[PDB]
Short mmCIF file of C-alpha atoms (C1' of nucleotides) and ligand atoms in Angstrom, two decimals:
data_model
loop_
_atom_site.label_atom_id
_atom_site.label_comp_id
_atom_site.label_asym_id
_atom_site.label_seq_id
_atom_site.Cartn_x
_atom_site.Cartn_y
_atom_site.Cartn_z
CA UNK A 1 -14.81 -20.98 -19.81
CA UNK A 2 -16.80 -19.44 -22.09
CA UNK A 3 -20.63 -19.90 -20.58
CA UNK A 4 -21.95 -17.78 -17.92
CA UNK A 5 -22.98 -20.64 -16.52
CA UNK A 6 -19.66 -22.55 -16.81
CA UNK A 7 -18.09 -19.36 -15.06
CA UNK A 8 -20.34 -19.20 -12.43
CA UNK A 9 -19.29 -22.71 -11.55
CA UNK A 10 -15.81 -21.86 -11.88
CA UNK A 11 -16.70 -19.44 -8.90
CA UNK A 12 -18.85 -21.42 -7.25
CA UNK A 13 -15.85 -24.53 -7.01
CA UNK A 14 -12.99 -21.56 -6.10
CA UNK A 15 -14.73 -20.17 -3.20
CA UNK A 16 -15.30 -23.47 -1.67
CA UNK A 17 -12.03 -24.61 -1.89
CA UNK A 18 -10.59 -21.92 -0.46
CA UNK A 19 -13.33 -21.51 2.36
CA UNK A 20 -11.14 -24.85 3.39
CA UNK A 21 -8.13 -22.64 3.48
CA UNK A 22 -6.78 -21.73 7.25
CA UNK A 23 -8.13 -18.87 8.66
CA UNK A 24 -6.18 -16.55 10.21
CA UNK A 25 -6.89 -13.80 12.44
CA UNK A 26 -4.65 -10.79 12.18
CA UNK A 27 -5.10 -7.73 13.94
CA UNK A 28 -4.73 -4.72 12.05
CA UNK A 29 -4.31 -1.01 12.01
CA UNK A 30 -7.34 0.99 11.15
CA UNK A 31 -5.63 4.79 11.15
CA UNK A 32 -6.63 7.18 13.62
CA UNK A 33 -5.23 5.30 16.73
CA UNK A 34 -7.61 2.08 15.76
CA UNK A 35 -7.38 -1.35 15.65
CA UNK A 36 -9.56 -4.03 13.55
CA UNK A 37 -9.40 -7.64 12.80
CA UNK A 38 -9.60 -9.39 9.49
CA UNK A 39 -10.06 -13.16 8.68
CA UNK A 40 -7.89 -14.12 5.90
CA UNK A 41 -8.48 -16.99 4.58
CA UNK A 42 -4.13 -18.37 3.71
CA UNK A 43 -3.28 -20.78 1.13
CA UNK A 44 -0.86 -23.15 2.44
CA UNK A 45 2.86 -22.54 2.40
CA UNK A 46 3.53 -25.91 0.72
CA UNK A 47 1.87 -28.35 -1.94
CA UNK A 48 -0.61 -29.76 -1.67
CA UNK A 49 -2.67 -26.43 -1.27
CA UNK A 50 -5.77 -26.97 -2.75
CA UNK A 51 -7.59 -28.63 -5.24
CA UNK A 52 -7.51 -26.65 -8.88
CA UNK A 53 -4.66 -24.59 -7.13
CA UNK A 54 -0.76 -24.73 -8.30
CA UNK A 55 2.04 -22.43 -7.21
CA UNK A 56 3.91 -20.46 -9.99
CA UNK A 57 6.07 -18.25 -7.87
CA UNK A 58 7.22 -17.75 -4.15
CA UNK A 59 4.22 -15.64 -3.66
CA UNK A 60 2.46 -16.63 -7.19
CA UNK A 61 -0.59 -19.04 -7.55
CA UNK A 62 -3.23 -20.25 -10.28
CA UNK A 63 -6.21 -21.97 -10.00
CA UNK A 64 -7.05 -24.45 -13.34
CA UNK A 65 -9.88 -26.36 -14.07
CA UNK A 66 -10.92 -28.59 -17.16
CA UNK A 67 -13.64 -27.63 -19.17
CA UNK A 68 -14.86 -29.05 -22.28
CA UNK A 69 -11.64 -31.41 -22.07
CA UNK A 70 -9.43 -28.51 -22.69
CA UNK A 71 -7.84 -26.82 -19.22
CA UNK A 72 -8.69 -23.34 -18.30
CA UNK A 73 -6.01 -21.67 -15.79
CA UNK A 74 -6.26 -18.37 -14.05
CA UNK A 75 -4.36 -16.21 -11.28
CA UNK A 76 -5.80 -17.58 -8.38
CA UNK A 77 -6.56 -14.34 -7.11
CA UNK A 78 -8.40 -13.39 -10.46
CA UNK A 79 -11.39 -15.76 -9.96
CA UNK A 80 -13.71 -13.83 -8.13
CA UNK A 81 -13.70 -10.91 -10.98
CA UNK A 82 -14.26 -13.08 -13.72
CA UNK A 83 -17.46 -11.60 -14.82
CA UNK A 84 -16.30 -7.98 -14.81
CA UNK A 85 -14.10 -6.03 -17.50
CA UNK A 86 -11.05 -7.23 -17.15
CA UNK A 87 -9.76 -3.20 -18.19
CA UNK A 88 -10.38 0.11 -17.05
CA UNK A 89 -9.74 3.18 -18.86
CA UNK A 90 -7.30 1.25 -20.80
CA UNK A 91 -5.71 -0.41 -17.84
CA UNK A 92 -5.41 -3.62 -16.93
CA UNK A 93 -7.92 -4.47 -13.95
CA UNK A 94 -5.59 -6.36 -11.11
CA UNK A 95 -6.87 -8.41 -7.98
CA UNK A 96 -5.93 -6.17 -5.14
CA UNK A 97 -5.57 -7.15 -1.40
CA UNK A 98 -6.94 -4.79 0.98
CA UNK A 99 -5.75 -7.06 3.56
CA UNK A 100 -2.05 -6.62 1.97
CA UNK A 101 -1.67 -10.86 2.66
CA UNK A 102 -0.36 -12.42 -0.29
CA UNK A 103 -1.59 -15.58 0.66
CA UNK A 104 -4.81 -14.66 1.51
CA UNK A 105 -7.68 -15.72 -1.05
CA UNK A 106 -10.54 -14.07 1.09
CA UNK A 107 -12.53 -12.67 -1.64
CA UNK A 108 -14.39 -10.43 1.02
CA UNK A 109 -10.68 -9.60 1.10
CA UNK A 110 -9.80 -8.13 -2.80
CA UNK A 111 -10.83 -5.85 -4.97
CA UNK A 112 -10.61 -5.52 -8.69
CA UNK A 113 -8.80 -2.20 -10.02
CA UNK A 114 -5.94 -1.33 -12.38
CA UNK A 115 -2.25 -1.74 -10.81
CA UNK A 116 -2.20 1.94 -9.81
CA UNK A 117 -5.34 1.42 -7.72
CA UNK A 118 -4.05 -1.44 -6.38
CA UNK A 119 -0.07 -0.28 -5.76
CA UNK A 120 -1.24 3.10 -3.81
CA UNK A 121 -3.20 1.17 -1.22
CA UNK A 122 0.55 0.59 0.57
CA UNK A 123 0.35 4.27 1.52
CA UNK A 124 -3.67 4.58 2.41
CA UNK A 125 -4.18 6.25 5.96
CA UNK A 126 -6.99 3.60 5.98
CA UNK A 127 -10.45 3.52 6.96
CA UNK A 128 -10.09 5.41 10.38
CA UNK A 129 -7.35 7.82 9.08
CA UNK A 130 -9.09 9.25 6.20
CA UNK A 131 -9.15 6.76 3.38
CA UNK A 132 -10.74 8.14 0.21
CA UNK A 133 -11.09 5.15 -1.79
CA UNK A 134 -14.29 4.44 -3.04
CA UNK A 135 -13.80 0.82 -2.59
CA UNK A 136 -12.93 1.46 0.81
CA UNK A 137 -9.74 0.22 2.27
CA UNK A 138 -9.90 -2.40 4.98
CA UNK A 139 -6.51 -1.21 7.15
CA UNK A 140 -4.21 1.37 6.36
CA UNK A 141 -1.45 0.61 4.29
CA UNK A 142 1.88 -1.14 5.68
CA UNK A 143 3.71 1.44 4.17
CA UNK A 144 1.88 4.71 5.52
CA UNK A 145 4.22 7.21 7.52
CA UNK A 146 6.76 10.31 7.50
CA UNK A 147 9.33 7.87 5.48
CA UNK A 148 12.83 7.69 6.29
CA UNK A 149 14.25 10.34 3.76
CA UNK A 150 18.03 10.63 3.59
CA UNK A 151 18.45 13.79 1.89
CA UNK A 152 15.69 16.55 0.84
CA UNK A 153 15.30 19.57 -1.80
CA UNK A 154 18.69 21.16 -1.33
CA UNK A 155 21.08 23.36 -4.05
CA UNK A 156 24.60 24.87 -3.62
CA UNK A 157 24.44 27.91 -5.56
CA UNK A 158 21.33 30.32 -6.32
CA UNK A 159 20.42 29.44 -9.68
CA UNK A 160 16.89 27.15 -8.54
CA UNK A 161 13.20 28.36 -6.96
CA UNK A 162 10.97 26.21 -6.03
CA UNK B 1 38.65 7.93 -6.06
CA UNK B 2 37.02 11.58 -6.30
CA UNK B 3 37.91 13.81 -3.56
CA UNK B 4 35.28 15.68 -1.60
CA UNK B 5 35.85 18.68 -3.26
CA UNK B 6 36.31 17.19 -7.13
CA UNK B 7 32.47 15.98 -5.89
CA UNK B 8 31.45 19.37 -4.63
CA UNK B 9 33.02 20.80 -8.31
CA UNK B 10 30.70 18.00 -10.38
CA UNK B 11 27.36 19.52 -8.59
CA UNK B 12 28.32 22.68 -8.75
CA UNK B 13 28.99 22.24 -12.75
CA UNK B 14 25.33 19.95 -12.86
CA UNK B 15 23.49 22.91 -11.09
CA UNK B 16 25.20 25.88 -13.53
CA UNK B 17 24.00 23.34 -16.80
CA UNK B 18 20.52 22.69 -15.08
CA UNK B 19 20.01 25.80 -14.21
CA UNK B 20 20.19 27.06 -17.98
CA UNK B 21 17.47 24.67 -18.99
CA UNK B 22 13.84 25.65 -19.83
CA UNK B 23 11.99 26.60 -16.44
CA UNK B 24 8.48 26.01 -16.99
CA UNK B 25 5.46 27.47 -14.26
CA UNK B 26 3.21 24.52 -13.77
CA UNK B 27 0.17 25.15 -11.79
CA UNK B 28 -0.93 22.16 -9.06
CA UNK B 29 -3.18 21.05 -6.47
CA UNK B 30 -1.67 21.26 -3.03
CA UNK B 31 -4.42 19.42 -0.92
CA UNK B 32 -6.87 20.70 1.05
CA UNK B 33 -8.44 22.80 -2.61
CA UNK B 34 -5.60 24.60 -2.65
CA UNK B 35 -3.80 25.42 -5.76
CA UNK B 36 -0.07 26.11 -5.95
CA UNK B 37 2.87 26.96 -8.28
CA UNK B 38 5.86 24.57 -9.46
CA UNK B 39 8.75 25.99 -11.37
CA UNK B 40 10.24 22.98 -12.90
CA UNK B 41 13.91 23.15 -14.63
CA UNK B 42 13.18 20.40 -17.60
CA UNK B 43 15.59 18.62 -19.97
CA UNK B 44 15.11 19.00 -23.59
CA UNK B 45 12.88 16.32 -25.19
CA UNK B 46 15.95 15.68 -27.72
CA UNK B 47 19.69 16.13 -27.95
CA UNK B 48 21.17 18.17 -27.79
CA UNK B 49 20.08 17.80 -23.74
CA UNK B 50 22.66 20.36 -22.17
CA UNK B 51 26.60 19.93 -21.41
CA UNK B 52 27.81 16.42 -19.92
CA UNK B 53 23.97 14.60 -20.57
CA UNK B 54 22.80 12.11 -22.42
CA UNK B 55 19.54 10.18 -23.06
CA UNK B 56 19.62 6.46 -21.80
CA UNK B 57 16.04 5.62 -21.52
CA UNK B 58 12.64 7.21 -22.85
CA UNK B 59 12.58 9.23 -19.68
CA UNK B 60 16.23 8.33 -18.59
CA UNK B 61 19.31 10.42 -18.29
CA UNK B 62 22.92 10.44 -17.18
CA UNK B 63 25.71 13.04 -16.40
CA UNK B 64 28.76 12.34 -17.27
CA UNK B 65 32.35 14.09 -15.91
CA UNK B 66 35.69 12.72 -17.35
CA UNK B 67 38.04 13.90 -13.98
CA UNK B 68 41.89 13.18 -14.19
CA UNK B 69 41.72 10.66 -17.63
CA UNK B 70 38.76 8.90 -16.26
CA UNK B 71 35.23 8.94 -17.22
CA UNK B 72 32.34 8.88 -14.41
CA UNK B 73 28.94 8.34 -14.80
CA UNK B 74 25.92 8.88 -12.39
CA UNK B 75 21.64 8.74 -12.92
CA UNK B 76 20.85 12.75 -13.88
CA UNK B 77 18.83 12.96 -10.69
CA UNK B 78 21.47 11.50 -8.41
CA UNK B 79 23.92 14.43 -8.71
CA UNK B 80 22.70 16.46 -5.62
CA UNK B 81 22.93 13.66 -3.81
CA UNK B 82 26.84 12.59 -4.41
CA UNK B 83 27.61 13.71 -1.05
CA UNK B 84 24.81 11.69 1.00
CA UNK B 85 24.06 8.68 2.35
CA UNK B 86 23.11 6.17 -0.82
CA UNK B 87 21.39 3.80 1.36
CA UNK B 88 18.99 3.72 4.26
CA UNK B 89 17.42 0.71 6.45
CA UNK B 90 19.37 -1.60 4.16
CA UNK B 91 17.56 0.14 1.11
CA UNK B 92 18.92 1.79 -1.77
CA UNK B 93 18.60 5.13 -1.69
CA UNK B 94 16.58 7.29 -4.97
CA UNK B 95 16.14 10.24 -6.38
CA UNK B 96 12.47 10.92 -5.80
CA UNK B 97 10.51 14.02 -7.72
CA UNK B 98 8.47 16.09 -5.10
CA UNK B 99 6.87 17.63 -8.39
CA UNK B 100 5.61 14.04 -10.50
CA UNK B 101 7.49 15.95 -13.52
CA UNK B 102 10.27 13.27 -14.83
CA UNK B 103 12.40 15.92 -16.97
CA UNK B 104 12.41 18.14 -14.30
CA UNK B 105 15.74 18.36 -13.20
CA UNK B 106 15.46 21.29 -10.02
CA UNK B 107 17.17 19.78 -6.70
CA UNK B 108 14.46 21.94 -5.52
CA UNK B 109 12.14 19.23 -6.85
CA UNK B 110 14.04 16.19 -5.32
CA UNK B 111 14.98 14.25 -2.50
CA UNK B 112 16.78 11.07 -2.07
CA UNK B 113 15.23 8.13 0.09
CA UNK B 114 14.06 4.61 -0.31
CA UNK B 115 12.29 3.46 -3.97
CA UNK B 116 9.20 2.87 -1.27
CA UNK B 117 8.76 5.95 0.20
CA UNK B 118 9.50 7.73 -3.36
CA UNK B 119 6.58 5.70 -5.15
CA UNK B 120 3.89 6.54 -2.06
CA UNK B 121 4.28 10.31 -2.72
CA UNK B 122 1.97 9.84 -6.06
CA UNK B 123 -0.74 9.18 -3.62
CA UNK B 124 0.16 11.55 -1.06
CA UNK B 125 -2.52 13.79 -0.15
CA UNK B 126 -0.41 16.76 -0.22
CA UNK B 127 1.32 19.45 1.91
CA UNK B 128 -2.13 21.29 2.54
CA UNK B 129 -4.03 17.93 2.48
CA UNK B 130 -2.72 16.05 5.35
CA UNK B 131 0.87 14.91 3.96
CA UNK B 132 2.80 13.36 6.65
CA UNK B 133 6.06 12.64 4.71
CA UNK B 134 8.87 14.16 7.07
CA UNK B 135 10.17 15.80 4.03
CA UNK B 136 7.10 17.27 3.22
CA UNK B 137 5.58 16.76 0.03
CA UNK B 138 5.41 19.87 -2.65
CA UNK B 139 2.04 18.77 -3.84
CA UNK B 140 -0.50 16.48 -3.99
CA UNK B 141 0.17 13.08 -5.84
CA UNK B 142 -0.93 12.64 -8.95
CA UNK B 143 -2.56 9.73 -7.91
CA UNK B 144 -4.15 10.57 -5.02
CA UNK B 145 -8.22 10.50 -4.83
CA UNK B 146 -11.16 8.21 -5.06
CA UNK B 147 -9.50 5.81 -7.61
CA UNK B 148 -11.60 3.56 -10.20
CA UNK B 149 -12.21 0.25 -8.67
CA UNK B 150 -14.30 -1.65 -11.39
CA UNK B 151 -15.53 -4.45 -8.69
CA UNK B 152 -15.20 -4.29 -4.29
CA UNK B 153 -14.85 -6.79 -2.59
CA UNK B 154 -17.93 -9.46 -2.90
CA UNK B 155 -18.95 -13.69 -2.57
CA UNK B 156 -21.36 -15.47 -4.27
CA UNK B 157 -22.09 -17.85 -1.31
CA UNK B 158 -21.36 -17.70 2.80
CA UNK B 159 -17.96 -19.47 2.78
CA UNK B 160 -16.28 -16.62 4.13
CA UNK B 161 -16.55 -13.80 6.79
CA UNK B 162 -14.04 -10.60 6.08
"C1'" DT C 1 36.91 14.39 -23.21
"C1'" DT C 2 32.54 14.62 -25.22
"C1'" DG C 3 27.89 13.55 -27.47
"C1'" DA C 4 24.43 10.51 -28.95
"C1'" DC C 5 23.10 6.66 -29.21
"C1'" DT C 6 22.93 1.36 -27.69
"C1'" DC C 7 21.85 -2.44 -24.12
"C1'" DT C 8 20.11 -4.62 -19.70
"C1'" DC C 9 18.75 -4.25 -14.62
"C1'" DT C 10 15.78 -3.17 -9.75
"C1'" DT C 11 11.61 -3.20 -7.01
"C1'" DA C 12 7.16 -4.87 -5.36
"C1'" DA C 13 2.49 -4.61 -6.52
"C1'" DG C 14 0.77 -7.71 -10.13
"C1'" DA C 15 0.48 -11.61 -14.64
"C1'" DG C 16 0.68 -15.72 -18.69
"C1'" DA C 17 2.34 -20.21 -20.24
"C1'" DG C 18 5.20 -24.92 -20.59
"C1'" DT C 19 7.13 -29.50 -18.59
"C1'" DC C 20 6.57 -33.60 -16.56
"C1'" DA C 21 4.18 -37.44 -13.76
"C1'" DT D 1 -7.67 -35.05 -15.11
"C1'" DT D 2 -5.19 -33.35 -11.53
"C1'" DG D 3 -0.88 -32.09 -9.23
"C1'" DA D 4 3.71 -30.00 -8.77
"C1'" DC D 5 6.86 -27.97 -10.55
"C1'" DT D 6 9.56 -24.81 -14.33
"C1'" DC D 7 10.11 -20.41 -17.04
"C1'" DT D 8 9.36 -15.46 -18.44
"C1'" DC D 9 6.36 -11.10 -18.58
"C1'" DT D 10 3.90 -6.09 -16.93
"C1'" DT D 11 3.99 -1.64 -14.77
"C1'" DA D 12 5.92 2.79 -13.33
"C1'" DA D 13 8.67 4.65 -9.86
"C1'" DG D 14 13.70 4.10 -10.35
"C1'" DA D 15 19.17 2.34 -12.07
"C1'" DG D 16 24.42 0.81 -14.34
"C1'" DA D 17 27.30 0.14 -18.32
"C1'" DG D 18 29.14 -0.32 -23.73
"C1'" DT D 19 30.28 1.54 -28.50
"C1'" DC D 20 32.02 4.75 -31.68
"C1'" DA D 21 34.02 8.81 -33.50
MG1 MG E 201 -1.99 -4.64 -3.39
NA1 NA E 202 8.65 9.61 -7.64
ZN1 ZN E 203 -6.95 -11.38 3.81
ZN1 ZN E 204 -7.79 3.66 1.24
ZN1 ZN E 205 10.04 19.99 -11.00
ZN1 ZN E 206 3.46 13.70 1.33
#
DNA sequence: TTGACTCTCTTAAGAGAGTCA
DNA sequence: TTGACTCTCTTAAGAGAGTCA
């Protein structure tokens, strides 16, 4: 809500909810032939999950709260970041996993960066493979590799240059 | 429906049209510092667009053929691709620009694999920056770099260990 | 047969808001 | 007040199909 004070406490009541969350230990790739291991911290699969928290998708939560008897809701991944511009460069800023778990509310696990930001982190070599993100990466991305191209650059006839 | 060779004759009439449209020298990073040169074949901003194409989308084209008394349609970029694959690791295949330049419409530019692999190239370090796409990237992404993270990853008490 | 428009949809990273009990 | 559901929307890489003359 609108105090700093009343958003601190906002905060304060997310993270220790979700320090009640599971943890789970999964072993990641680091780039560069390494292995690391991160502690998410998983919201249940299944109501109940929490208290403030409420599932609006298959892989979609908020977290609410009532302040000044009117109810104040948020992505529940969106808490954390509440007290920083909520734009950049005329972007929206976007709660981005670096440990690329959904379910994971780990705030040692997110970062706060426009969609772009968040999206390429897939492809990152990661933090042993030559990540260049300033907020470093925490594994490399699921999605880093060669691909599995069907068909490259390719013409018939000799009207095209590179 | 369309023989192999009435497909053949629809890319070879796609390249002879492409190949008449405005080729523009664009100059780009390549990784590594490295500066190289794109020659990009681009669709006019406005009809008319060249023979058998036609605007569907801000940045959205299609060709169009009427073979035999019956009109077929395909995506603008999909034409060199009419004789591949169209799906990979259950996966649709797309047509994915090597050069980040939408109107571009050089097969030289393009290859066909998964929507997946063709975002990650925007943050693809490039061919003389450590790409490791199997079809090797023309040029750096777009994207790739140090990004703008507004806020890293960060608690307010000791609830949580990363 | 052709051109120039029109419309909605897919994906996977992310969101906001309403209906009930 | 709190919980457990429902719905649609955003973005930027990509798509298919209809109407009219
Ligand atoms: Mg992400
Ligand atoms: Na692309
Ligand atoms: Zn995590
Ligand atoms: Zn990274
Ligand atoms: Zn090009
Ligand atoms: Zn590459």
């Amino acid at each position: 809500a609108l105090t700093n004070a009343q958003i601190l406490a906002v905060i304060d009541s997310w993270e220790e909810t979700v320090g009640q969350f599971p943890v789970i230990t999964h072993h990641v790739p680091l780039g560069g032939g390494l292995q690391g291991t991160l502690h998410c911290y998983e919201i249940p699969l299944a109501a109940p999950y929490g208290v403030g928290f409420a599932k609006n998708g298959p892989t979609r939560w908020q977290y609410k709260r009532t302040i000044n008897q009117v109810v104040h809701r948020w992505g529940s991944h969106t808490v954390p970041f509440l007290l920083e511009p909520d734009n950049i460069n005329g972007k929206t800023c976007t709660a981005s996993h670096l440990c690329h778990n959904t379910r994971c509310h780990n705030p040692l696990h997110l970062c706060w960066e426009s969609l772009d930001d968040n999206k390429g982190r897939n492809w990152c070599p990661g933090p042993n493979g030559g990540c260049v993100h300033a907020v470093v990466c925490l594994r490399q991305g699921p999605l880093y590799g060669p691909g599995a191209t069907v068909a490259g650059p390719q013409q018939r006839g000799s009207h095209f240059v590179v």
